[PDB]
Symmetry: D2
Subunit: 240 residues, 4 copies
């Protein structure tokens, strides 16, 4: 579809409409592979999806995948992304463990091959960073040809991760993280970009109307042939 | 068999799950053609669809179609089916008139050709009668090769239609009605059969496990390659 | 698609056009499941498909399936259908054995479940009998709700099968055969019906313009939402021009 | 969608035959399909096979064909080089109806992207790969990946590049500008089929399959498409890692 831009009134409507788009894949009768984002943007969306699938056994051919992961330094516990996805949705929605596929540093080199063998991703539900990052593809360090790759954590990135994605302390920041690169993301059959808040308005303008550039990684997503963007009024404020 | 049988706890769950299946088509980014049923079975489903699309301008490529129609004798007003669909959904959901395609006795002969030119039906949401009828395809009088056809109203049919559709008023029963025949229904890319209540349990068993026969018209729907049935426990009680 | 009727000049054109339709599935980049017919109608079509895929390793996600099978009575060899499919296409086209899925009396009870697990049939290429049969769904004995089933061979059926399949040898006609029933056939995502010759003109008219009836089994195929018929002029002669 | 599929054929003849079979998968689709098709010497044999498959057949009447670039002849009012070559290579001998031929020109370029979306979008684009990695009229360094259908001024070295790749080395008829579907418009197609033949394209093909995404080698961005099939002959695939 020519990129479809959906502008909702607020976070609540953005969240509801996004849940309806994802339900179109959840209700498909054959197997569907969905890569889903963590973070605060999808919290309400996941509350709607929880109410739609909790206690229902007939969505057993829906397989869920994390698209990035940050392990806890010196700890054997599950990483931050799958942990947040369980808290936001897999646990309360009662998703079967055999339908949850975890990406880690250990299986990253086989992740792209496993997805193609499973029929490829039907949908990726992603968020947009204030700086235009998507998944773990950050400004300037992003390479568009990258598939699933390991990214070293150095310098200022230590405090940024400790304070934000981890929301704990310096000691738990590992040496590196894994992310599906832009090529792996673009390989999905369909993309659903959810955007909320004034802090994302500039990044959204650069994605919709700006040039394709590694400085604003998500700018490459406008090249996808099947992209739907669901933004609230605050996030769409800079669009013309 | 591809046929997917979904058994919900009750009418409320049946209605919610059915709305999520229809939202998969409503949220598709390109044009979709949906034929939708009237009657009491879909009332709650339409309440959910109303809340999902009311006041939203981004589902403007969704086109809706009635699959049968009974005009009011001697009156030029719209028939009973489109009138019930407006009350149950098009009016409260604020569906644009340009996205509502009415089937009448006058345009029936051109209906099948107009649908194929519009790309064919993407989905038909139909109900199941206690006698196994679907659309206006009634027991014994149904012909499986029929496309969109006019059906004369005679004998006992007059009182049945007057009481079930026109509040027992026999003077408003017309000479005939129009219905998409079994071949026209089967030409849809996907079928969604919604069934609720103990009164439908026997018909549902005949459809899922019985032989293909004109005596139980809906029995032919099990031959469709893309059928999803959403029934509540009461309607699924005779299934093994 | 509203049933699409393609009328070609003769058997050669019918065969070429049919090969192009099947190549649309063979060239799909992901896995496709194709159920393919034996008999004389598809012989030339298979010669075109052989030339298109022989010695090519990039169509390795195409899986082929027989839709019926008649074993040789008292013999342990492969049945007549898979044997004819190997001679007409799998052998000369060099199709890998891992991409050939055999239906037999022994695995019939699991056939429908195995197809759905593999993603269902993408296409079924079938022929039309002079009596309107398709697969092993013969007149009057056909039941439209049937999935993959075993069919007993009795009375006149014995000589008909011996002469049309086992070179008139009645000792090789078994007690029964297996066929994908009308419901299993209709479950395919797409149907391609190939028809050639004056002997099929009456059956084709009954299918395209006649009522749905067990007397002419293929008459039910006009209810499928994705059917393409490729007939030559001789087979289309009774259709209303 | 499919992880990019790389098909390596023995020679130009096999490349041409296999490419015709892939396109026939769209031509035989029962509903309307929109195909954008390339001119040039690479698809000549492919078009001969497609001509034999559709000539004298009235049942492929819902197949609509589109040119993805156009270079008018300077000071001449005749049709441009792309639609002219497509007619000579295929539309004329294949007897394609004029109502199924949709021409892109400088005059209707501003409405081209909107007309395609209204028609349901492109189902397939059959494109060639230049020795320098160009695709359509998206040439090295001057290409912008966010571009949709745009007019491109012709200046300096671009005169010989356009004359040799589009107008058979004739520099005298090179106009002031040309029109091309930009990388964003190309990437909007539902499926891409990249055909590549000859030793002169081996380096560009390696940069596309194994190199980074760069405007220096425009076709390098096509590896981001979720539904790409590449059909190359041995000579063109010679630099790919065995
Ligand atoms: Cl966030």
């Amino acid at each position: 579809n020519a990129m479809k831009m959906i502008v909702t009134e607020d976070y609540e409507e953005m969240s509801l409409v996004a849940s309806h788009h994802v339900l179109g894949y959840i209700t498909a009768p054959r197997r569907v592979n969905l890569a889903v984002t963590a973070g605060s943007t999808p919290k309400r969306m996941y509350e709607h999806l929880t109410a739609a699938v909790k206690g229902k056994a007939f969505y057993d051919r829906v397989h869920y995948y994390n698209f990035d992961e940050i392990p806890f330094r010196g700890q054997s516990r599950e990483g931050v992304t799958i942990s947040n996805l369980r808290q936001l949705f897999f646990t309360p929605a009662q998703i079967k463990e055999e339908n949850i596929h975890k990406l880690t540093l250990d299986n990253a080199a086989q992740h792209d091959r496993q997805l193609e063998e499973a029929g490829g991703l039907d949908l990726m539900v992603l968020g947009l960073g204030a700086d235009g990052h998507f998944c773990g593809n950050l400004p300037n360090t992003t390479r568009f040809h990258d598939q699933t790759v390991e990214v070293p954590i150095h310098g200022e990135m230590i405090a940024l991760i400790a304070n934000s994605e981890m929301g704990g302390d310096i000691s738990a920041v590992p040496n590196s993280y894994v992310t599906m690169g832009p090529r792996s993301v673009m390989a999905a059959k369909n993309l659903l970009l959810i955007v909320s808040g004034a802090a994302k308005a500039h990044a959204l303008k650069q994605v919709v109307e700006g040039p394709v550039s590694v400085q604003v990684p998500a700018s490459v997503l406008k090249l996808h042939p099947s992209l739907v963007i669901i933004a609230d009024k605050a996030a769409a404020a800079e669009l013309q």
